[PDB]
């Protein structure tokens, strides 16, 4: 029921570093109305979201839920810092109406798997909400074993997993071992291969600007029209190759400003986008998205 | 363009004393051609324990293979591995024997820069006059070549394709669009369905010695946009591969080939002999997936 | 130049409810200063589970540490981790409290290029006016900085040194010769003797909470060219460290500190509690190596 | 008794690719007389030695043993290809008089440890010679565990190990667990740190041209004169930094030609050394070695 394309909301910032509330609402509206996404992924690692305070993470969650209402599905990423920040955020967004959570493991310590399980099971026990897990524990690089997925999926309110690494063998194994769980692709350049292996959705940050093509790839592949889907994936990956060449986070923001959305400013010590990269973003915009 | 299809990576059987079992070799070729109905044979690949044999034992394998297969199937001769002079000597031997396509891994004895890899491949093409399939990863470096590096190699018209060994589907898709006129072979059997929908022209694998039927079906069904049926067969194939890998891939394939009446030969020291527990597991996999 | 010597990486003790155990914190400081006779304390480091605490809990730790240590030892305040605004806010807080040296890991939320790392460090130096020790590896990248990148950072005169976390002794030797006027700290206790003979000015480690005596001896004996005696103590130190690592380093250090009368506090969820088997093993190591 | 500095002999080649016999003798003489090395390491991975035939590997071993006689220790590396080539080479060099062997594991297969042990134990059983093992199985990157060293060192004719990776923690552990075995450093840039941890010798290819400084570092460190040894190591590493900057294999050969030794030609497809790199090798020669 949570299927479809999700855009990873990137939070825009004012000149002074605070959150640009009206700019945040404009990005939500652009994703819902123009990109016609099936959901929003709020609080993800995308861009520079993990640096903001707990207080500012809570204001972003409330602004998002009040502007999106339920035109779309919403998932709240509440992990990363530690387990009690995850629980406080998890019960705040549960009280705001967020019907699903996700959590990356904490960054301050390399936890064994038995502590990953306690971490995830505690967020489900203390919030009562649904949970999406990550196939890779935060900053470890190693995918979880298929046996470890089974131990986590024994909990019924852990309803899915977001794949960040493009291991399609493990993806296929998880897909067959757990036909009742949701699997989200977290790689936009390989959406077509993921869709034919039966993923239920995709979460990406390019879908802020390329959501239309992604919904077509997702829909055409689930109806076995591979010839047309591969051709759109070829065009999508020419956009992504240019965006990556040009700096992905800043190119997406610069393209959003070319579409009439105030995507805000960057926070130090990140270097400002150059004139050559602004002109290159406009060439990408006119070639692929206008 | 005629070299599309599923290829089996021939594994060389050995006698008790370590020499090659010529009649076991002929029976494996017949099994792949008649029962597996493969579209071609990949001879001389790194698969199993083939890189340990002498160049002269390599010449006898190439001659036995072309003489047992006739022209029922495509043949690709892997002539690299050791050095450039053995690659050229092997490359001209198998070209005179009738092989119409070559492949070559870079030599193992040195970490060559790209400008010396290109001279390596271009020299084998000039001295044999044969077609060439390159590897996306230089031997024992782990890093895929850049898309610009593919362009410099693909400037040669007798470098007709590339065998992908790492499952980087982003790079696979980029190479596919940048060079629509070149052949691309998947070298990963567990991900055949994803590679096929991105437009690979064939697959070279060692599981096709025993699972060639399912692989041909996945390849044909996916190229005809019937993903639902193709995904179910890929699921069954990966249940076999997961068991084969759990049990030791090289030895399980050999023991399964012996359960169907093919003399797969013996192992060479210092490789350990397969256990009774693994023979029984190979038999369960055989009865469950292939009988 | 006055900040040479052995430094202990303070591990913050926690109460049963997760808040910081202030009196346990004072007792750990006293144990390091009086019994271990360390030359300084490294406060706020990634060691153990310190990066999980709030900035406000970080401010109370910095204030407790400077007030318990007075000026018996050098103090370095690690103010990085979260972002640049917390680093600058922390950096000016501990500068007003009397800390004479800072260190900062790069932020964790983004993979910064080098030109943004340099702005990061130069901004903390300009906004606090304090001295700065950099890390040879940007937080969560794994790759050491280039020797040219060290030169661009060391152009700032208030960047007085570098803490090496990876044991690359070739790069350590190159940095040592290229910048004889800068401080270099080893951050690997198992290789103290090799780092000292290459001219490191000190060591920052977490084993020095309990093995500071042996580490000071290795440091002093090696800088006075008595390698034979220094190697024997390094052998004993590494027998302790091998046991500590086998048993879980963070929890074994805490349990050993409790065997000598220091309230090392409790663990925070989701970390698992130490077993009886590991408590008994910590006691054997204590009786064998430190009593 | 095998202590000291060993030079890794690099085989010079004629214009046609064959072995330059008189050039090989000249390199042996330069290492024995001018570099005053304590031994020669023949057949190692250095340069481009692993490509030559078994026949040409046998001629190199005999030329080396007949020109060096016993002015120096000799170790013969007989592994890499497969186990029966290792045994044939091992008994040939045992019949030539080589009193110690070494062997890297085969390249054609990723052997488990129980097959590494059978591999090494077979070369010792079939030749009766002494054996030096490598801490890293050929092309795997992973050091052996200290428990695995113990299982191998249970054989008394496996007398030592050559360390290729600079893990000084593992080096110190192996040194203490087996005080009766030889340990050779295989990293010239870190000779001083290795010497203070009690290594019995060093095997390197820079010792073809920098053997004098290396013997001084080795001798000064074993007599606790660290101040003088570190200063020579600083100078040695300035040479090595330049050699590496310039291409190590070709710079060493070009420096040997600047010292009056016919170090031969390169084999295709290796690119020939440039004029800028020849001039740079001469600057290194005049600055560090003349």
Numbering used by the authors:
A (entry chain A), D (entry chain A): 0 to 289
B (entry chain B), C (entry chain B): -1 to 137, 138A, 139 to 289
Q: Which passages does the manuscript contain on this structure?
A:
N-Acetyl-d-neuraminic acid lyase (NanA; EC 4.1.3.3) is also known as sialic acid aldolase. Here, we report 2.32 and 1.76 Å resolution structures of N-acetylneuraminate lyase from F. nucleatum in two forms: ligand-free and with ligand bound as a pyruvate Schiff base.
The structure of ligand-free FnNanA was refined to 2.32 Å resolution. The conserved Ser79 residue is in the disallowed region of the Ramachandran plot in each monomer of ligand-free FnNanA. However, electron density is well defined for Ser79. All four subunits in ligand-free FnNanA are structurally similar, and superpose with a root-mean-square deviation (r.m.s.d.) of between 0.127 and 0.169 Å for 290 Cα atoms. All four crystallographically independent monomers are very similar. Small-angle X-ray scattering data of the soluble protein also concurred that the protein was a tetramer (data not shown).
